């Protein structure tokens, strides 16, 4: 049942001597490594307190010890015997153990104004002073250890991790504190969080690992659960063949405890766990090692201590003389400092009380029997001293010791080594093991897209089309000047296409126009040589001059239509796209009209048509030319000559093949309107040719003019359907240009073929025929 130690004043104590268990016995195996190890140490300290001349002078401190089991409903029921003594009297308690054990008891004892102190549960909950007004821990809370875990993960430069905790306030709030602090930091994303039931099924642990392994960007797992919970997981790791797949980690729940790692030593290699900053207690280590197990009075479980530590009875009855220090039965207890510390701390608070409440007394003072625990609480918080092993004893008003704890590494060859320490900051030094980090870094041009909103995660998405990179997460469209770098680091010139006069198609008019000029000049030279001969004068020497000049320009114009882009090129091109067509028609109109007017005038009168004299007729031709020049000037005014680069025409799907064009910016509106006026003169010429159908052969040029128009008007009109039909082609730069050069040169050719070439043959080769016809 319980240990009852006499004294003048009494102090309670509480520990997991059993674990939890079945319905008929909620108290299975002896947890010697939290329980009786620490209990003897408390009792050791109790005797030392009683044997300390300067502490609670002349007062024997007695004691009451109970076994928590672990299912904390057992604690209270029990607490009830303790409580009846409280309301033989007990002053206070060392209460501690796990979450459910401490939190239930903190709510019963405070109601009778009885102070309670924890060598153990760090859980956040107990810092609500509105619920635990009588309470302190002696250790930093999970609010520190969670932060520390976050700092260590960040020191590992990991970003992406799985956590596991078993049920009960310690686990469930502790890992939740780690989750929240990790989220506040932002440098980490939680792959997952796995709860373990207090009563899990066998094999669940293999299922847990398989779930832990789904999030393959994690190579590490964090634990707040108890010892046994950890073996079920790491045992599963052996079965799952995950040994060395992982990093593993612990809050205070496990560490220098050897039973976690033994028989699974390769599992969790290098695993890092935290312990509250702890030193061994040499006086106890010695005592414990040297104590005879049947000479320990008032320790009802010490016989069991022999049985479980020496694996035999105190059957294999073995001699009691063997010291525990002579076998595997012995080692240094990981927390013994805290249980010894906590009991001294209360003893020191009681001492401070006597010096306050009973300042004139040693030994018993009746004032402390019905002591108001509030005053006891004041000294619990007010007393500050160097504790056992020299560790300063202080905790704040919410009963947290101030943060300070050490970071350990599980080293194989096997021991937990110190890596470093923490006090709201890490001091670690490094063993080489895997990394837990989410998405991997991305190439040039791979603009990150965040994986959802998850800070540590992304899709490395390659940039596209005319876009080039501007941020690790962002890419933007390159302007018309350029097509992206393939790395999308930036952008590179669109190659610009020029119209090449030597292209496979440009060469045709390039040379035909030259031939046209040569043919024209052959004719001009003959006409000049024969300028004063009737064969030339008869057709109108001046009219011939203008027609030949027109023809010359028609060809000169077409040659230049494929000239290298410039501004000089644009201005001359536009004035001559017009003139190279219109001069010929203006001249044809003047002459054709003279023929028609003479023909019709002769039906009514012998007088020559008025103003048919060359003195006025040449002006008519030039006036028609000027009318167009003025219209052209307007076109220049509304939209002036420019040498420009077109990027937009071939902005293709694959930017390496994007091509711009260096072109004269002549809008199709003016390309046509500059030809339109001229066309109208052509139309008028056609009409005159029709008006002249009744004209006789006595008019020397009346017939061949009609013929030039019969063909010329088609040569020209064919231009429009082609020009527009080819307007959608990638090759239109040369197709439309040569379409235009060809009809202008051909019209010039038509005029020479009927009006000049056969006449020149006679003028030059047959002098006997040089008559005015």
């Amino acid at each position: 049942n319980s240990i009852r130690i006499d004294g003048d004043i009494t102090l309670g104590g509480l520990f997991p001597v059993h674990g939890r268990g079945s319905e008929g016995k909620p108290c299975g195996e002896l947890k010697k490594e939290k329980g009786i190890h620490r209990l003897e140490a408390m009792l050791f300290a109790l005797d030392r307190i009683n044997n300390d001349p300067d502490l609670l002078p002349n007062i024997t401190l007695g004691a009451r010890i109970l076994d928590t089991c672990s299912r904390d409903t057992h604690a209270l029921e029990q607490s009830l015997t303790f409580v009846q003594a409280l309301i033989e009297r007990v002053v206070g308690v060392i209460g501690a153990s796990g979450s459910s054990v401490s939190i239930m008891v903190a709510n019963i004892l405070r109601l009778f104004k009885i102070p309670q102190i924890s060598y153990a549960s760090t859980a956040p909950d107990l810092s609500d002073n509105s619920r635990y007004d009588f309470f302190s821990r002696v250790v930093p809370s999970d609010t520190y250890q969670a932060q520390a875990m976050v700092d260590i993960v960040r020191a590992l430069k990991w970003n992406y991790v799985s956590t596991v905790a078993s049920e009960g306030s310690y686990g469930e709030s502790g890992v939740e504190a780690f989750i929240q602090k990790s989220r506040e930091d932002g440098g980490v994303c939680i792959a997952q969080s796995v709860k373990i039931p207090r009563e899990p099924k066998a094999g669940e642990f293999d299922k847990i690992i398989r779930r832990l392994l789904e999030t393959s960007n994690a190579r590490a797992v964090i634990i707040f659960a108890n010892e046994d919970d950890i073996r079920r997981v790491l045992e599963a790791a052996r079965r799952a063949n995950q040994t060395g797949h992982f990093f593993w980690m612990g809050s205070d729940s496990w560490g220098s405890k050897i039973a976690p790692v033994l028989h699974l030593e390769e599992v969790a290699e290098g695993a890092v766990t935290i312990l509250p900053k702890r030193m061994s207690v040499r006086g106890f280590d010695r005592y414990f090692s040297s104590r005879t197990l049947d000479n320990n009075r008032r320790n009802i479980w010490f016989a069991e201590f022999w049985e479980d530590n020496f694996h035999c009875k105190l059957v294999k009855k073995c001699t009691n003389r063997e010291r525990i220090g002579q076998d595997s039965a012995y080692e240094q207890e990981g927390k013994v400092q805290f249980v010894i510390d906590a009991v001294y701390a209360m003893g020191h608070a009681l001492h401070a009380m006597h010096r306050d409440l009973c300042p004139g007394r040693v030994g018993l003072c009746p004032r402390m029997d019905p002591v108001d625990g509030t005053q006891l609480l004041k000294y619990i918080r007010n007393v500050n001293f160097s504790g056992i092993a020299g560790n300063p004893v202080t905790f704040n008003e919410n009963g947290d010791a101030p943060g300070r704890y050490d970071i350990y590494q599980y080293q194989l060859r096997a021991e937990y080594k110190v890596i470093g320490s923490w006090t709201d900051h890490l001091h670690l030094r490094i063993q080489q093991l895997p990394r837990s980090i989410c998405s991997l870094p991305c190439q040039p041009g791979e603009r990150k897209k965040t994986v959802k909103g998850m800070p540590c995660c992304w899709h490395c998405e390659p940039c596209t089309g005319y876009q080039y990179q501007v941020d690790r997460y962002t890419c933007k469209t390159c302007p018309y000047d350029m097509r992206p770098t393939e790395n999308r680091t930036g952008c590179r010139p669109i190659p610009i296409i020029k119209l090449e006069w030597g292209s496979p198609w440009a060469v045709l008019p390039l040379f035909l126009a030259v031939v046209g000029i040569a043919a024209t000049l052959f004719v001009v030279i003959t006409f000049v040589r024969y300028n004063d001969t009737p064969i030339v004068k008869a057709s109108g020497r001046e009219l011939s001059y203008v027609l030949l000049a027109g023809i010359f320009l028609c060809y000169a114009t077409t040659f230049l239509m494929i000239a290298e882009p410039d501004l000089g090129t644009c201005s001359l091109r536009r004035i001559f796209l017009g003139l190279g067509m219109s001069i010929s028609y203006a001249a044809l109109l003047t002459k054709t009209n003279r023929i028609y007017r003479i023909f019709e005038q002769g039906k009514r009168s012998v007088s020559a048509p008025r103003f048919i004299s060359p003195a006025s007729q040449l002006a008519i031709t030039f006036s028609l030319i000027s009318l167009q020049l003025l219209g052209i000037c307007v076109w220049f005014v509304v939209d002036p000559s420019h040498s420009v680069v077109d990027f937009q025409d071939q902005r293709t799907l694959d930017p390496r093949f994007a091509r711009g064009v260096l072109k004269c910016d002549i809008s199709d509106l003016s390309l046509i309107c500059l030809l339109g006026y001229s066309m109208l003169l052509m139309v008028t010429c056609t009409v005159y040719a029709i008006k002249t159908r009744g004209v006789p052969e006595t008019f020397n040029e009346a017939k061949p003019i009609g013929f030039t128009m019969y063909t010329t008007c088609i040569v020209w009109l064919a231009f429009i359907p082609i020009f527009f039909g080819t307007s959608q082609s990638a090759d239109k730069l040369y197709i439309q240009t040569t379409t235009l050069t060809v009809s202008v040169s051909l019209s010039a050719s038509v005029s020479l073929g009927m009006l000049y070439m056969p006449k020149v043959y006679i003028i030059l080769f047959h002098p006997e025929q040089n008559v005015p016809k």
Binding site: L76, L80, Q84, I87, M104, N107, I108, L111, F112, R131
Partner: protein, 738 residues
């Protein structure tokens, strides 16, 4: 020391203030006759009735351990713990009900208060397994807010005592108030421990903010007294209402009966159990010794002593009996617990008529969440005329009944409380019983300021009086923005985010038809002297002006762009640059041969208008929706050259021939075809006038884009046609009639 131990299959513990506090002298003071013993005896009467009840727990005799709270917290736990040791109905004062709950829940033992109300015992994170037979004064907020709604009353001053229950009620009231859009004018808490002047200060502070002249109170009656005394001393003019912390309480209204008229109070409605009053009145514990604290009760209730057996001679029934209405909660608490146990047994012991082993352990939540709150009936021994639906909500709030009543003037007697109505979950009130609201009494004093003006008018932003903000219109282009303004929309009138055009269409079309019907006359006659003697090219340029007026009319109504408005303005030149100008050569030849004279005129016509063309084709301003911050629904305007003086150049082009050449009017005297010569002299002059008559529309109609478009379209067509006919009259006379 004694717990009225009762035998049974299931034992219900409990805790009553049998004794008063003994302070520091003794733990326990004298017995509480009304708070302790009468409530316990009622409990016992009900427990015996339950054990004898044929339908409720017929298989469970209820035993008991009823503890003496001694009106102290120390005793409440020293003794409450005994029920834990042993394996609960209790809580009168609240310090006790709270601490008991703290222990009982640790052992999974539910607790029902029978008298403790306190709102703190709503917090299930600390006190999970509990029920309150009486709802804390917080609930009154609901009724209070509803009374204000009844009255259309809304904007109002309010008060608590120094009570934390006062804070609770005030916070609760604020919640219920806001839900119903009821605004606090101002408010405060009120000490017991302050001078009478401080109470007057509270009343003045109310009276100092008369935006409404009315108020409401959470209190306990010791405060309500001095508050009502201050009200009376100050001759305070308002009406007001209180929490049942001053409900009825004739005692408060005695110093201030007059001021007390202007008010209503809630009480929790009283439904005393007459059966128990009867049992207690006839009770004689001398013989019926089960309750151990009666010996003191007898000695002090009747003035006697049992030391000499003197009280033995004075049957307890000798002293008249009265009970608090509170007795009903004592009873509801035992029945509600018994019922919860009953339903628990139906669920856990479904086939057995005696208590089952299933109920030997403590069951926690199984009682608390499943059977304790889920109680629903009419209370036993309750007056047959009414109902209380005893139930609890999910937090253990015992659902209840409340009287709403006013203090009436009695010009013929003492002033009296009068039920106006009641509250239950909502309010019912008869207005005819209200001295300041019954119609003959006139309306309630100001209790309002301003409406939910949240629309085409929106509230002002008057500092301070937010709940009283004025109502103010927005401006006629906007849409709802805040409670107090409006956002500017797109373009249009208040968006909340061509009628006579047939005129110009008709005339333009008719103009064109008439124009060409006539042209065909002149053209058919090109070989006739009427044309040979005319400047026919100009006759035709002139006639064509009307045809152009038609063409221009349709351009004038084209969707606006500079492509058309430039032409529009030029068209006001064009119509007469041709329609007047042909007169130049007709006049000249009658007043470089005629063929050249015609060509010269044609050149002059084009020349002068082209000068103007050059001036207008270079104007940058175009079309749009500049419109006006006025009108707003003005859509699609012609180019913004309103009243541009450049238009005078068109008038010029016409007058250049029309007025500036009238020396030539002398042509009417010329001996050549006088029918025409006379008319040229007549029509040059007449035409100048006709055209000038139309001209003013250039500024006259500029205020309305639909009007001027319609107008210029008609005027241009008409003017041209009227003018052509001026000279065609003699031309057509000869052609058509000779």
């Amino acid at each position: 020391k004694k717990v009225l131990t009762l035998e049974g299959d299931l034992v219900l513990g409990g805790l009553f203030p049998v004794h008063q506090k003994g302070g520091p002298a003794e733990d326990c003071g004298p017995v509480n006759e009304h708070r302790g013993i009468q409530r316990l005896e009622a409990m016992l009467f009900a427990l015996d009735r339950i054990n004898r009840d044929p339908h409720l727990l017929p298989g469970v005799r209820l035993g008991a351990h009823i503890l003496d709270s001694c009106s102290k917290d120390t005793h409440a736990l020293e003794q409450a713990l005994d029920f834990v040791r042993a394996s609960v109905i209790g809580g009168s004062y609240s310090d006790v009900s709270i601490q008991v709950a703290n222990l009982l829940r640790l052992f999974q033992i539910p607790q029902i208060s029978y008298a403790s109300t306190s709102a703190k015992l709503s917090d299930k994170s600390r006190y999970d397994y509990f029920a309150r037979t009486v709802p804390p004064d917080f609930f009154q907020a609901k009724a209070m807010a509803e009374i204000l709604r009844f009255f259309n009353w809304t904007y109002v001053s309010t008060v608590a005592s120094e009570g934390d229950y006062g804070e609770t009620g005030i916070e609760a009231f604020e919640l219920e108030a806001r839900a119903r859009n009821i605004c606090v004018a101002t408010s405060e808490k009120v000490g017991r421990a302050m001078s009478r002047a401080a109470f007057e200060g509270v009343v003045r502070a109310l009276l100092q903010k008369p935006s409404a002249r009315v108020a409401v109170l959470f209190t306990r009656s010791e405060d309500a007294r001095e508050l009502l005394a201050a009200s009376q001393r100050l001759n305070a003019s308002f009406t007001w209402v209180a929490s049942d912390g001053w409900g009825a309480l004739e005692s408060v209204v005695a110093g201030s009966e007059g001021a007390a008229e202007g008010a209503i109070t809630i009480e929790l409605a009283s439904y005393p159990i007459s059966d128990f009053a009867s049992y207690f009145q006839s009770l004689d514990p001398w013989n019926n010794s089960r309750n151990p604290w009666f010996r003191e009760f007898w000695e002090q209730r009747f003035r006697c002593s049992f030391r000499q057996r003197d009280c033995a001679a004075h049957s307890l029934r000798a002293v008249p009996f009265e009970q608090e209405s509170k007795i009903m909660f004592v009873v509801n608490a035992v029945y509600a617990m018994a019922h919860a146990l009953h339903n628990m047994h139906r669920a856990l012991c479904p086939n057995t008529t005696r208590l089952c082993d299933a109920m030997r352990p403590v069951n926690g939540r199984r009682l608390y969440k499943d059977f304790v709150l889920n109680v629903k009936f009419d209370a036993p021994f309750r007056p047959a005329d009414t109902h209380n639906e005893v139930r609890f909500d999910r937090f253990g709030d015992g659902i209840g009944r409340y009287n709403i009543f006013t203090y009436l003037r009695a010009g013929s007697g003492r002033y009296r409380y009068q039920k106006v109505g009641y509250w239950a979950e909502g309010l019912t009130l008869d207005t005819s019983l209200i001295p300041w609201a019954s119609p003959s009494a006139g309306p309630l004093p100001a209790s309002r300021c301003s409406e939910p003006c949240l629309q085409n008018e929106v509230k002002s932003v008057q500092p301070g009086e937010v709940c009283c903000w004025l109502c103010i219109p927005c401006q006629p282009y906007e849409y709802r923005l805040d409670e107090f303004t409006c956002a500017d929309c797109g373009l249009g009138y208040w968006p909340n985010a061509d009628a006579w055009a047939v005129g110009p269409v008709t005339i333009a079309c008719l103009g064109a038809l008439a124009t060409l019907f006539v042209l065909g006359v002149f053209v058919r006659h090109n070989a006739t002297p009427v044309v040979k003697a005319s400047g026919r090219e100009l006759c035709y340029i002139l006639l064509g002006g009307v045809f152009l007026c038609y063409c221009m009319t349709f351009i004038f109504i084209a969707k606006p762009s500079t492509a058309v408005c430039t032409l529009r303005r030029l068209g006001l030149g064009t119509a007469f640059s041709v329609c007047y100008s042909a007169l130049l050569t007709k006049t000249n030849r009658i007043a470089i041969s005629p063929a050249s004279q015609v060509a010269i005129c044609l050149a002059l016509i084009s020349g002068q208008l082209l000068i103007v063309v050059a001036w207008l084709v270079v104007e940058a301003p175009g079309t749009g929706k500049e419109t006006a911050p006025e009108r707003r629904e003005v859509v699609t305007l012609r180019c913004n050259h309103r009243d541009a003086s450049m238009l005078g150049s068109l008038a010029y082009n016409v007058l250049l021939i029309a007025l500036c050449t009238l020396y030539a009017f002398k042509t009417r005297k010329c001996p050549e075809n006088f029918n025409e010569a006379k008319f040229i002299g007549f029509t040059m002059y007449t035409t100048c006038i006709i055209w000038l008559a139309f001209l003013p529309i250039f500024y006259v109609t500029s205020s309305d884009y639909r009007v001027q478009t319609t107008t210029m379209c008609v005027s241009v067509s008409l003017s041209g046609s009227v003018v052509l006919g001026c000279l065609f009259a003699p031309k057509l006379h000869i052609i058509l009639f000779q």
